[PDB]
Design a protein around this nucleic acid. Structure first.
Lengths: 50, 130, 184, 83, 186
RNA sequence: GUUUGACCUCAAAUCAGGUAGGAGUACCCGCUGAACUUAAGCAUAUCAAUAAGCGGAGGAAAAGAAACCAACCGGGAUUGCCUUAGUAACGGCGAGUGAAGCGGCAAAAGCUCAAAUUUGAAAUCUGGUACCUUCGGUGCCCGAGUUGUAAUUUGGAGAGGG
RNA sequence: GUUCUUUGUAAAGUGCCUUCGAAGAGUCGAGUUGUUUGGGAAUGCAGCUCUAAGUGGGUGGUUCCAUCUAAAGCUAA
């Protein structure tokens, strides 16, 4: 047996909530318009540096 | 003295502050009901017994409804997000009320949540809707 | 010739590393995994680079740019902190624990090979904390573990365990004995 | 009358703790022995616990120190020789 | 975890592993300067439980002091550890001495590893767990014995045994040696 | 491969940005430390854990949330005042030194780390840099960092689930 | 007071059930010389020798009992 009988948490099986927090922070930043999305970042360089 | 002798002799001028009368009489600030009904001629403890309120909960060393009704008058007197709502829409439309099946579903209940969490959140969804 | 102070110090420390008799919990290091098995351990371990800060940032902005406008399994990576590796080992969540031979205070990782032999965790002392660092987005790592694995790499990992058991643990059963560093 | 008070720290005095017993014994085997303990374990096999406790008491602080220490060394011998 | 293995490892100091570690390092520290900076803690476990966080603004300095003191027993009743802490306080005058620990010892020298916080560093000035050291009431805590070892040497604790030095021996002397006279004489 | 590249340690730079010294010093925290004197002449002792010297702080400092006190029908961080009280104890039991608990009162306030895996994801931070509503915020970049920065946890337990 | 923002399956708290569960070493201590205290109980501290344990350990009280949690840190009046 392992040394301690510590019950495994839900978060070790469930998709991570820290990841969900970061994602739902960038979501806000896109609604506000302070992070330009990765799809439009190509379009900003397809028109520029020619 | 050495420094005071020069400062009382110099043309710089003293930084005179007459803040002695302000030390005794400090205006009451935290409650406008008390701020209107506080006799400044009376003391602290006299203004407490005048209003009715107990000033010291321990019995003091030494020898010792007009407004409290107004206080009693003013003292007797969480939504869900777009994604959470749409998630509960999916669960209800696919299952309905079978919470055992609803929580054993890998596709919609991605966070492996209990039955109690689901029935509480769905009733919040149902109260805000029809 | 005349060398600097620090150059003389590290050369003196090098010859001091050889010429002293050393306790057998140390010199259990330097009796380390050979070139072929080390390259073959990394041919597996390189398939599980922890997602670098740039890669994680771009992907989680891809989640935002897609999911906010218009299912995935838990991904597997190597596990790399000493608090976390000695957590994983003793919980028996470790299938291969890689230990660096060169650590700044040696006293840090001295219990680890013998704790791995205790728990039944198939360990390998590999050469270089820099070389462990490369597979893990860090300068140095001291320890690298492989808990869970994709099924394509599972059979290779199990054989990597058996190769390391035969190559490392069987050739170096004498290393629990024998005080190292008696070089004349 | 009494009111059955709340339990404290050293009432469950030294709660067993399976893990720390393991850790102490894990370091004990790895670290080797201190030069006096190295003499002490030779002294049990040759001269016995009599002189072993005598040296241990002079070396350490009190007699209760020497009890726990010679017994500790007797368990080093009991494990190393048999099992 | 990992530090419990370290903690209980460093409790055995004459044990053959730590004997060898201490043999190499005592010589290696002699070859360097008296007060020099450590790249990182040698004992990260004891550093951390004395409050070393491995982040920007946290410094480890290694220090050396001579041992000892009836001319050869004219005493000097301040510790070796407080002497060490003060010397690193002067060479690194921008920092603030947080704590110090023992690392290696010898016939002539006892060694220490002082831990130092940069109160001017912005990674210390934020984070509300460590920005207490930026308050100017901590300018040279080691010079006034406000560190762990200083509070020991002052004899500051609780009880019967420390009555002569519980609020500080100078303070209690001055207080109890004062003819207090009231307006209406007691 | 006699090559190239990771690290580790140690340097330098009128590098970018910071910071330390000196003054004042009543009080406060330390270090260091006498003598005249007083004791019968006098190595103990006394003046005195004083003065002088040296360092270090602030509006207060220090102390402080028990490895505390007690022996009760138990109190409950520290500090300060009255009391204990010239009491207990020390001392050629000489000159002399000399508290503390309790009780009353002033004022009151509590907390934080390290040690058990975030491991379905270093979630943390500094700097540079472009804007903005600038004791800061946001974007991007170089880094620090797994030899451990974040969140959770401190015995009054606490944590994972239901 | 008036007003603009709040969100994300986000952060807590209460009671019960259920499963677990670490606590500061050249440190305590012992000896020792020196200093220091009202501290005779050896009061504190400093140097040097030696140096621990976890149903631990310390401190008190007539077979035992009581009460603390050291060797990490902050905090007004």
């Amino acid at each position: 047996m392992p040394l301690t009988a510590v019950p495994e948490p839900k978060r070790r099986f469930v998709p991570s909530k820290n990841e969900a927090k970061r994602v739902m922070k960038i979501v806000r930043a896109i609604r506000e318009g302070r992070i330009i999305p990765p799809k439009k970042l190509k379009e900003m360089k397809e028109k520029e540096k020619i | 003295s050495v420094r005071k002798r020069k400062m009382n002799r110099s043309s710089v001028g003293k930084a005179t502050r007459r803040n002695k009368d302000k030390q005794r009489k400090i205006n009451i600030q935290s409650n406008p009901i008390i701020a209107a009904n506080w006799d400044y001629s009376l003391t602290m403890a006299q203004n407490y017994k005048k209003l009715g309120l107990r000033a010291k909960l321990q019995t003091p060393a030494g020898g010792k409804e007009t407004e409290v009704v107004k206080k009693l008058e003013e003292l007797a007197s969480r939504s869900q997000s777009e994604r959470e709502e749409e998630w509960l829409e999916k669960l209800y439309k696919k299952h309905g009320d079978d919470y055992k099946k609803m929580f054993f579903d890998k596709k919609l209940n991605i966070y492996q949540q209990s039955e109690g969490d689901l029935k509480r959140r769905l009733l919040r969804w149902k109260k805000r809707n029809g | 010739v005349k060398w600097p102070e620090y150059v003389r110090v590290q050369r003196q420390k090098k010859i001091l590393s050889i010429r002293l008799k050393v306790p057998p919990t140390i010199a259990q290091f330097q009796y380390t995994l050979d070139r072929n098995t080390a390259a073959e351990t990394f041919k597996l371990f390189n398939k599980y680079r922890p997602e670098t800060a740039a890669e994680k940032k771009e992907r989680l902005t891809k989640e935002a740019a897609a999911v906010a406008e218009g299912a995935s399994p838990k991904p597997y990576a190597v596990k790399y902190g000493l608090n976390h590796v000695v957590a994983l080992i003793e919980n028996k969540k470790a299938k291969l624990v890689l230990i660096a031979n060169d650590v700044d205070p040696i006293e840090l990782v001295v219990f680890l090979p013998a704790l791995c032999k205790k728990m039944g965790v198939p360990y390998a002392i590999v050469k270089g904390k820099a070389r462990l660092g490369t597979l893990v987005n860090q300068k140095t790592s001291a320890v690298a573990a492989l808990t869970e694995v994709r099924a394509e790499d599972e059979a290779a990992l199990a054989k990597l365990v058996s190769t390391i058991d035969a190559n490392f643990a069987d050739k170096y059963d004498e290393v629990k004995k024998h005080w190292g560093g008696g070089i004349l | 009358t009494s009111m059955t008070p709340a339990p404290k720290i050293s009432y469950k005095k030294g709660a067993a703790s399976n893990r720390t017993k393991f850790v102490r014994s894990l370091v004990r085997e790895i670290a080797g022995l201190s030069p006096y303990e190295r003499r002490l374990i030779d002294l049990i096999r040759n001269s016995g616990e009599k002189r072993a406790r005598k040296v241990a008491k002079k070396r350490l602080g009190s007699f209760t120190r020497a009890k726990a220490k010679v017994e500790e060394m007797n368990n080093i011998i009991a494990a190393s020789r048999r099992h | 975890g990992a530090y419990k293995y370290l903690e209980e490892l460093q409790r055995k100091k004459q044990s053959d592993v730590l004997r060898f570690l201490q043999r190499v390092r005592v010589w290696e520290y002699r070859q360097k300067n008296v007060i020099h900076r450590a790249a990182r803690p040698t004992r990260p476990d004891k550093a951390r439980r004395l409050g070393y966080k491995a982040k920007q603004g946290f410094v480890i300095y290694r220090v050396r002091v001579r041992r000892g003191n009836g001319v050869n027993e004219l005493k000097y009743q301040r510790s070796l550890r407080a002497t060490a802490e003060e010397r690193v306080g002067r060479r690194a005058a921008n920092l603030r001495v947080l704590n110090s620990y023992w690392v290696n010892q010898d016939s002539t020298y006892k060694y220490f590893e002082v831990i130092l916080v940069d109160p001017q560093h912005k990674a210390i000035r934020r984070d509300a767990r460590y920005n207490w050291i930026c308050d100017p009431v901590h300018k040279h805590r080691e010079a006034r014995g406000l560190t762990a070892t200083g509070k020991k040497s002052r004899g500051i604790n609780k009880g019967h045994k420390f009555n002569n030095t519980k609020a500080g021996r100078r303070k209690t002397w001055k207080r109890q040696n004062t003819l207090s006279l009231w307006r209406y004489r007691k």
